[PDB]
């Protein structure tokens, strides 16, 4: 049973002695015996190389088994491994938190492996620093070497630091480097609309059923009801929500209905609702949408009815497109079509620098309406127009001087350089030479509030500082503005003329209320009421002796004193905000003011020219009747005569008496103190905005910013980039103040008779933290497939899941009020979808099915794993389950060590049989497949080569090579070491023992 010495009461351990015929083998634990000749190979034998395979194995298809995204692998994915080579040395039963980076054991191919391999090395220090770069023409064999190095490197430093949050940021920083893992091969391209660089429209598949959608229905836009033709861009910025799904629809109505009640919704106040909408990106959107907003102000406010219903709530469109104007008033002008026309006109003529600007006239005809004799009501199309707004020619430049200022790239800051650039933009501003900043301010806005059948709205960025707290710094404009914008309200009115002289120069009058025609007498009224506008753009302006400049103020105004309102100087203008001290100028029997190149009466400035200045290149002057009660104000009410046609808004004197204000800029900084906020200034305010004739006050977009630095509008949280539609300041404050400072602000307004206008955003939601796969095709911004790019009908990991909590508590929850109240609104037939909205379904959680694409988010285009030819891994949830071979357990059937016959053999991971080779088992013995690939087993002393000279080895009955013992037999006693190979001619040590061999191995001593 046990072999002792009794000279030493020691115990031999892995000791083989011959009893006589006997055999007998005590083994390395315990030196227990058992009889050699019935030693027997273990069936369940594995080799080290297939311990090592199966290790590696995924431990499980639980999701919490492998990182996922329904269902699908990214580069991303970690997973649970049967086995973990503990501390590189010991393979160990995995934890569950024993995640390890599937691209430790796995690559797409031998290319990527060896980049692998030198980032590990160069990158991880997971390779010694002076091995040589692999290259694609590098052996597999030998990558699989350098692999299991480093996954025995990564495992011994997770060992030493207990952690493998370093290997996350080490294996994600690898992957971004791969083009296929990255933007480079997303075809990022900035043409049209693709502000991001691009877009991934979102189509049907088997593989992500959960994403497919029956609409999708894109660029169905004013020109493209019927599909047929291009439309307007349906993609624009970040998750494009899918207007033309009518759940969607729904949806959209519910949050309208959430926006126009927002007062008594969500602090049970009715003086705080919004009054009208904007509807912003209107090229981008299912036109359905301005029917279904139509639609419910018609049923709640009937603003078909009259003009006094309409005027109510003054409603206003962001339509870029000309042919947009035409629709809007065919659908009953429900709310405010723009004049793009006329704007550019100004863009063209005024604001342009001196080498820029066009002949005058432009103003005259590039509009919705010809000024030249505008003497009728009702007869155009109504229209708001504007100099400036937040994002037209605001903040490109605004972004031009910060990049100036500071060196950075385009669009990149931080508030100080926002400062700083801010610095130099209204240094610029100052000047009379301007980089980024319109030139003829002045003029443009007697332009823009002295027209007639126009809906002006004057900008915030035009009366103060773009950037700075709210109303913290005035512009250099401020006071011609406002001198303008009260001069508005107490003169103009009645019917307008324009015509431009043999010089070039502009004379526009307006008569007075009363007077539609230069021959009509007028009224009571008129007398002290019209305005006369000389405007020119030619700085070097020199009117020769004996010319002059008319303005034909009209039959009310027979040998009338006229005195100024602005007059140009050589510095800048000067102002008059009453008669006081205004020089006087007197019109001819005929209604006539005449101008020349020589003063009136000796009145400085009142000679015409041209000049150069911060204020005015070229001329501007402007004249009003002298002797105005000061109370005098030359508005209309709008009547309550019942409509003849299908119309909200008409173009008249009464439309004509409103002004908008867009009261914020981009650039409006967070508040430092609860008194800066802008909501709380504006409630400080509203009678100022009264006074400067504002009716209705644009409040910039209320949603909290989504903050993720994707686009301008989450870098200056200007409310236009949010991910919860229903969070108005709630959740925390919006960048103006919280949604009480905002109900104070409607509320405010409201007291002094202003409406306010909610900034209604259908086309677009960011930020959604819940990932998707999603099949998706790159493609441009109308969704027409990007041909180049080979992400055509490919999985790909989108953002589309979330809403946040106001989405959640409100989504679809006026939708049963809606119907109960205005059923009309569910019967509706919509020109694009040819169906009704359907309330039968709340949105209460975005996700793809819901959304028509999005920006491209720079995974790659191979971030969702497939195998070479093309099938995605997947656990099973979505499609077929599949993973990587290194995954996966296979089938060992006739793989390993095999019995056939009276032999063994081991067949290689090729199912191949091993010949004249060593093969050493998961448990640490070694194994000899002869040359003949048998197994060598037979107790015998045997020469074989592993490398150079012959060694002398002994396989005991199971197979295993005997090694670090003695054999003792009746002819001598031999010692084998640790390699299995026969000791001659030496002494040597074997932990407590020393054995002296002599040359034909006999054990000499011990
Ligand atoms: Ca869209």
Same mark, same amino acid.
């Given at each position: ?138 052996? /597999? ?102 207007? /033309? ?61 009259? !003009? ?58 590039? /509009? ?59 240094? !610029? ?235 914020? /800029? ?341």
């Amino acid at each position: 049973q046990y072999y002792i010495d009794p000279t030493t009461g020691q115990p031999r351990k892995n000791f083989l002695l011959q009893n006589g015929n006997d055999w007998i083998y005590f083994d390395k634990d315990t030196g227990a015996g058992t009889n050699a000749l019935k030693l027997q190979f273990d069936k369940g034998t594995i080799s080290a190389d297939e311990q090592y395979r199966r290790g590696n194995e995924a431990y499980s298809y639980d999701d919490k088994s492998i990182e996922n995204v329904n269902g699908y692998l990214t580069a991303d994915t970690w997973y649970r491994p049967k086995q973990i080579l503990k501390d590189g040395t010991t393979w160990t039963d995995s934890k569950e938190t024993d995640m390890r980076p599937i691209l430790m054991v796995w690559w797409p191919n031998t290319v990527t492996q060896a980049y692998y391999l030198n980032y590990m090395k160069q990158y991880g220090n997971l390779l010694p620093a002076s091995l040589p770069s692999f290259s694609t023409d590098a052996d /597999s064999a030998e990558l699989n070497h350098y692999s299991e190095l480093v996954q025995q490197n990564i495992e011994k430093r997770i060992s030493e630091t207990g952690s493998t949050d370093w290997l996350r940021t080490l294996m994600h920083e690898f992957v971004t480097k791969n083009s296929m893992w990255n933007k480079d091969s997303e075809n990022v391209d900035y043409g049209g609309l693709q502000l991001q660089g691009g877009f991934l429209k979102y189509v049907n598949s088997d593989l992500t059923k959960y994403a497919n959608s029956d609409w999708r229905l894109m660029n169905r836009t004013a020109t493209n009801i019927d599909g047929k033709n291009y439309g307007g861009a349906e993609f624009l910025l970040a998750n494009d929500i899918d207007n /033309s799904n009518p759940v969607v629809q729904a949806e959209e109505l519910n949050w309208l209905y959430y926006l126009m009640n927002f007062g008594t919704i969500t602090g049970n106040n009715p003086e705080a609702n919004f009054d009208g909408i904007r509807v912003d990106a209107v090229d981008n959107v299912d036109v359905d949408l301005l029917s279904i907003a139509r639609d419910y102000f018609n049923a709640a406010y009937n603003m078909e009815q009259s !003009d006094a219903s309409a005027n109510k709530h003054i409603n206003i469109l962001e339509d870029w497109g000309w042919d947009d104007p035409a629709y809007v008033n065919k659908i009953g002008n429900p709310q405010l079509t723009m004049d793009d026309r006329l704007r550019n006109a100004i863009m063209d003529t005024l604001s342009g620098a001196p080498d820029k600007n066009q002949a005058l006239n432009k103003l005259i005809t590039q /509009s919705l309406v010809n000024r030249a004799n505008d003497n009728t009501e009702n007869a155009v199309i109504p229209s708001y127009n504007f100099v400036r707004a937040h994002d037209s020619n605001a903040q490109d430049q605004i972004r031009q001087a910060i990049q100036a200022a500071t060196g950075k790239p385009y669009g990149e800051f931080n508030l100080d350089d926002e400062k700083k650039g801010m610095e130099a933009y209204i240094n !610029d501003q100052n000047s009379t030479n301007k980089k980024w900043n319109l030139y003829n301010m002045p003029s443009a806005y007697t332009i823009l509030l002295t027209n007639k059948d126009s809906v002006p709205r004057v900008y915030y960025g035009d009366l103060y500082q773009d950037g700075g707290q709210y109303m913290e710094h005035k512009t250099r404009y401020f006071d011609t503005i406002t001198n303008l914008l009260k001069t508005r309200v107490k003169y103009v009115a009645g019917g307008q003329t324009m015509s431009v002289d043999k010089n070039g120069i502009l004379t526009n009058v307006r008569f007075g209320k009363g007077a539609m025609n230069a021959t009509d007498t007028g009224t009571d009224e008129t007398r002290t009421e019209g305005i006369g506008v000389v405007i020119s753009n030619n700085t070097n302006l020199k009117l020769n002796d004996g010319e002059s400049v008319v303005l034909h103020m009209g039959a009310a105004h027979k040998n009338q004193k006229y005195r100024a309102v602005i007059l140009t100087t050589e510095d800048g203008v000067k102002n008059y905000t009453n008669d006081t001290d205004a020089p006087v100028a007197y019109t001819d029997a005929n209604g006539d003011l005449h101008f020349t190149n020589t003063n009136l009466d000796g009145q400085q400035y009142t000679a015409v020219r041209g000049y150069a200045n911060p204020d005015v290149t070229g001329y501007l002057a402007v004249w009003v009747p002298a002797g105005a009660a000061d109370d005098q104000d030359a508005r209309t009410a709008p009547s309550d005569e019942a409509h003849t046609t299908k119309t909200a808004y008409r173009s008249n004197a009464a439309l004509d008496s409103n002004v908008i204000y867009e009261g914020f /800029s981009n650039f409006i900084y967070w508040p430092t103190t609860e008194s800066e906020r802008t909501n709380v200034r504006i409630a400080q305010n509203a009678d100022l905005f009264k006074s400067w004739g504002i009716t209705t006050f644009e409040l910039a977009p209320q949603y909290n910013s989504s903050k993720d630095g994707t686009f301008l509008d989450s870098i200056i949280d200007n409310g236009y980039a949010f991910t919860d539609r229903y969070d108005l300041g709630m959740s925390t404050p919006n960048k103006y103040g919280s949604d009480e400072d905002l109900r104070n602000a409607l509320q405010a307004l409201h007291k002094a008779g202003l409406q306010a206008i909610a900034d209604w955003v259908p086309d677009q939601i960011y930020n959604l933290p819940g990932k998707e796969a999603v099949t998706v095709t790159r493609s441009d911004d109308h969704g027409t497939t990007w041909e180049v790019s080979p992400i055509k009908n490919v999985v790909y990991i989108t953002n589309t899941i979330g809403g946040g909590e106001y989405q959640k508590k409100y989504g679809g929850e006026f939708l049963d009020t809606l119907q109960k109240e205005y059923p009309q609104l569910f019967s509706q037939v919509y020109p694009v979808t040819q169906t009704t909205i359907d309330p039968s379904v709340k949105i209460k959680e975005w996700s793809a099915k819901y959304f028509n694409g999005t920006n491209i988010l720079h995974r790659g285009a191979g971030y969702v794993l497939r195998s070479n030819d093309g099938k995605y891994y997947n656990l099973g949830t979505s499609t077929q389950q599949f993973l990587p071979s290194q995954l996966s357990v296979q089938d060992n059937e006739g793989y390993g060590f095999v019995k056939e016959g009276n032999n063994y053999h081991y067949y290689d991971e090729n199912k191949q049989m091993v010949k004249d080779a060593f093969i050493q088992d998961s448990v640490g013995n070694w194994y000899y497949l002869d040359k003949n690939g048998n197994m060598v087993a037979n107790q015998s002393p045997v020469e074989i080569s592993s490398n150079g000279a012959s060694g002398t080895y002994l396989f005991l009955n199971n197979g295993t090579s005997f090694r670090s013992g003695l054999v003792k037999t009746d002819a001598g006693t031999y010692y084998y070491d640790g390699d299995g190979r026969m000791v001659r001619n030496q002494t040597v040590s074997d932990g407590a023992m020393t054995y002296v061999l002599d040359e034909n191995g006999k054990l000499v001593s011990e």
